[PDB]
Design a protein around this ligand. Sequence first.
Ligand SMILES: [Cl-]
Ligand SMILES: [Cl-]
Ligand SMILES: [Cl-]
Ligand SMILES: [Cl-]
Ligand SMILES: [Cl-]
Ligand SMILES: [Cl-]
Ligand SMILES: [Cl-]
Ligand SMILES: [Cl-]
Ligand SMILES: [Cl-]
Ligand SMILES: [Cl-]
Ligand SMILES: [Cl-]
Ligand SMILES: [Cl-]
Ligand SMILES: [Cl-]
Ligand SMILES: [Cl-]
Ligand SMILES: [Cl-]
Ligand SMILES: [Cl-]
Ligand SMILES: [Cl-]
Ligand SMILES: [Cl-]
Ligand SMILES: [Cl-]
Ligand SMILES: [Cl-]
Ligand code: NA
Ligand code: NA
Ligand code: NA
Ligand code: NA
Lengths: 192, 192, 192, 192
Amino acid sequence: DAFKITTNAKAVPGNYVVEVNKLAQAQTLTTQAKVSDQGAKLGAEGVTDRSLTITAGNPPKETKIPLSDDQTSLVELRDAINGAKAGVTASIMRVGDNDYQLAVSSSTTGENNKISLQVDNDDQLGDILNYNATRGTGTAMKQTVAPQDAELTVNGTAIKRSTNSISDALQGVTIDLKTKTKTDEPQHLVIS
Amino acid sequence: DAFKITTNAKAVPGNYVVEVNKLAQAQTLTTQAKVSDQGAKLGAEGVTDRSLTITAGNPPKETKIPLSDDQTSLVELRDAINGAKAGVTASIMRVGDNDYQLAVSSSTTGENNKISLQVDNDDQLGDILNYNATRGTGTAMKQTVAPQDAELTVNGTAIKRSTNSISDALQGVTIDLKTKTKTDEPQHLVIS
Amino acid sequence: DAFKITTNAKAVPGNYVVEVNKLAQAQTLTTQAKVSDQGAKLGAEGVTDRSLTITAGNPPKETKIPLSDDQTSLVELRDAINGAKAGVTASIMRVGDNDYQLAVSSSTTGENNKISLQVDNDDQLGDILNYNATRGTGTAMKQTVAPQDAELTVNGTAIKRSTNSISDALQGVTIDLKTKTKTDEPQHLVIS
Amino acid sequence: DAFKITTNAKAVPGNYVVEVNKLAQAQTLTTQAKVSDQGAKLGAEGVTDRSLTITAGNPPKETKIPLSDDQTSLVELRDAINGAKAGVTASIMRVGDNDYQLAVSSSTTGENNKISLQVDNDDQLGDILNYNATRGTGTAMKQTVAPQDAELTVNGTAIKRSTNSISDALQGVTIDLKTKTKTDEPQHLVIS
Ligand SMILES: [Cl-]
Ligand SMILES: [Cl-]
Ligand SMILES: [Cl-]
Ligand SMILES: [Cl-]
Ligand SMILES: [Cl-]
Ligand SMILES: [Cl-]
Ligand SMILES: [Cl-]
Ligand SMILES: [Cl-]
Ligand SMILES: [Cl-]
Ligand SMILES: [Cl-]
Ligand SMILES: [Cl-]
Ligand SMILES: [Cl-]
Ligand SMILES: [Cl-]
Ligand SMILES: [Cl-]
Ligand SMILES: [Cl-]
Ligand SMILES: [Cl-]
Ligand SMILES: [Cl-]
Ligand SMILES: [Cl-]
Ligand SMILES: [Cl-]
Ligand SMILES: [Cl-]
Ligand code: NA
Ligand code: NA
Ligand code: NA
Ligand code: NA
C-alpha cells in the first residue's frame, strides 16, 4: 500500500521490511495580499524596467524575467511564471468570491529545492511577491508547504532522498513512495 | 484514497499536496416521540387547516403544505414531505419492533443549508415535528446530523465549500471528496 | 469501505452518513485442558449413558446427543457436535505440537445467541467441556470470543442488530457490515 | 485486508474472528563501518586461509566459506555470501554517495532463525562482519531488523508461528498474513 516496487536482474531475492516516515514535498509559496480580482493589475503604474527573479532547483538556478504593467495581475503573473520555465509552477487558488491567491510551487521536490522571489523596480509588487530568508508582516508572500525529503528505512537502514522515486538505494530496485507506513507497522516485501 | 480528481486543459501541471479536514454534511432532524406503529395517525382529530412549513436550502426557501388527518402518520408524513420537493428528503428508521422514527435530511449539504419545520393548527403534531432555534424537552424533533461544510487544504491554503465536489477552487480541477486524510498525512497529487 | 449497500424501489434518494461502532460476533467457547493428542479418548471408561447437551440459538434450543467412549476424543467430539446441527460449529485449533484445543462457535451471531454445554454421566469429560454461568478454575471450558450485536448509526440514529446484514432498519436498504468506521469519521452514502 | 485465506474439504463452515498482532520477520544484520567504495577491498593484505562462517536457519546450520583478498570488498562479499546458499541473502544499501552498507538477511523468518557471522584469519574484516551474542562498539556489524514470529488469534486463541503462511493451526485452512489488524478491530471470516 505505501509503495510500488519495480526490479531488474540485479535485485537480490530475499526478505525485506520497509518503513516510510516522510514523503518528499515541493515547497509552495502563496500570496497573502487581499486580491478581489485575479485580473486586476497589482503593480505600480508606468514601470518600464520591472523584473521578477526566481531562484529554484538544485543546484539553485536564477531566472530573471521582465514584466510589463499589464503582467502584474495574478493571472498574468501566473502565465509569465509558467512560461519562464524557472523551476517552479504557478496556479491561482480561488479561496472564495473576491478572494484569490497565487501559489508558486517548486517543479522539483526535496529539502534543498527551495525558492526565492525578488521583484526589481516595483516595491508595491515586491510587497506581494518577494520571498527570501526573512519575513516581516502578515501580507507578504508566505511558505504554505515546506520543502522536504523522502525518509524511509529498508531492512532497518534509514535512507533520505529528494524524490519519491528511489532508484539508487538498493541495486536492481526502485521504490516509488505513495504514503507513509503506519507508526509501528513496517511493510513486508519479498523479492523472488 | 481521500479524493478523486478530474482536470481540463486549464489545469497547471505541477506538484500538489492535499489535506481533507471535514466533509460537507446534510443536516438531519429525527423525530424522538415514541411511535410503535408507522401507520398510526399522530395528529389531532378533525383539523381542516393543518399545514407543515419547511424552510430549507441556501438561500432559504419556505414550502407550506397542507396535511389531512390521514396524512399525520409517519408513513404519510414521509410521503407528503418527499412529494413536496421542499429541499429535504424523508425516510423512516425502524429502530426496533414497535419503535419508529422519521428522519428529515437536507437535500443539499453545507453549514448554511439548515432546516426549520413548523406545524400550523395542530399542537399535538407540532410537539413531534416542530424544529427551530430552541428546543425544550426530550421528545421534540432533534438534530441528529449537523450541517457542515467541506474543509480542505490545497498546497497549504485552506478552502471551505458547501459541497464535496470542489470545482471552483483550482482552475481546471475538480476535487471530489471521499474521506478525510489521516491527521499528519497530506495526500500527494501530480498533475501532468 | 465499512459496508456494502443494496437497495430496492422503496429506498429514498438522499444524503446519509453512517457510523459502524461494533460488528455482530458469534460467541466461541474453547477447551483449555492440556490435550497432546486430538485422537486420544478424554472421557471416563465404560460409560453407556453419556450425553452432551448443547443450548444455543435465539430463542435458545437444547440439543442432547449421546456419546460413546470412542467419541470422547477432540476429533470425535468435533464430528459429533457438527453432525448434531445444534446451533454451533466445532473446529480444532492446533496450538502447537502436542497442544490441541476444541473451539465451539455459535452458528448465529448476536448478544443473545449464547451457548451452554453440559455433559451427563461423565464428570471427567464434564471438567473439559461444561460451560454455564459460572467458572471455577483455569482448565475448564472458557469463552474466547464474546457474543455481540452489531451497533451502527444511520444519520445519527443508533441501531442494534444480532447480525451484520441489516435489512430491517431503513426501508428499501440493506447495509452489510464489513468493518467499523474510523473514530471521528462517519462514512457518506448517497442514494439516487 | 490483513490476510488471505485458502481452504480445502477439511475446513469447518462457521463464524471466525481473527486478530493479527505481529508478522514474522527475517533478522537482518547490516555493516556499520564507513565504506566509501563498494568495490574496495576491506580485508587485510596477503591472507591465504581467510574464511567466513555463517550460522543460520532452524535448526542452526554452519556454512564456512573461503575468501581470497579480492573477495573482501562489499560487492564480492555479497556475491560470495549469496553463492554460498548459507541460509541468508546479502544486498548492498547505497545510503548516499560514498556511503555503502552490506545487509545480510535470514532466508527464513522467525524468532529462532537468527544469524551469527565469524571471520577467521582476518581481524580487520572481522571488525566489519563479525556478529554474535555481544557487541562492543559503534562500527561493528549491527542488527537492524529483529527476528520475530507471527502472532495471531483465531476465535480468541493465540497462535505463534515462524512464518506468515499459517497452514498448521486450523484444519483445512491456510492463513497467509499480510498486515496487522487494527488495535481493537478483529477481522471477520465466514467459511461456507
Ligand atoms: Cl509526509
Ligand atoms: Cl521548469
Ligand atoms: Cl490556475
Ligand atoms: Cl534547510
Ligand atoms: Cl519550514
Ligand atoms: Cl467529516
Ligand atoms: Cl427538493
Ligand atoms: Cl422510508
Ligand atoms: Cl451557524
Ligand atoms: Cl450543531
Ligand atoms: Cl467489533
Ligand atoms: Cl445448526
Ligand atoms: Cl477442525
Ligand atoms: Cl447479556
Ligand atoms: Cl463477555
Ligand atoms: Cl509486525
Ligand atoms: Cl540458502
Ligand atoms: Cl545488491
Ligand atoms: Cl530469543
Ligand atoms: Cl532484538
Ligand atoms: Na529554467
Ligand atoms: Na422546492
Ligand atoms: Na438444531
Ligand atoms: Na545451506
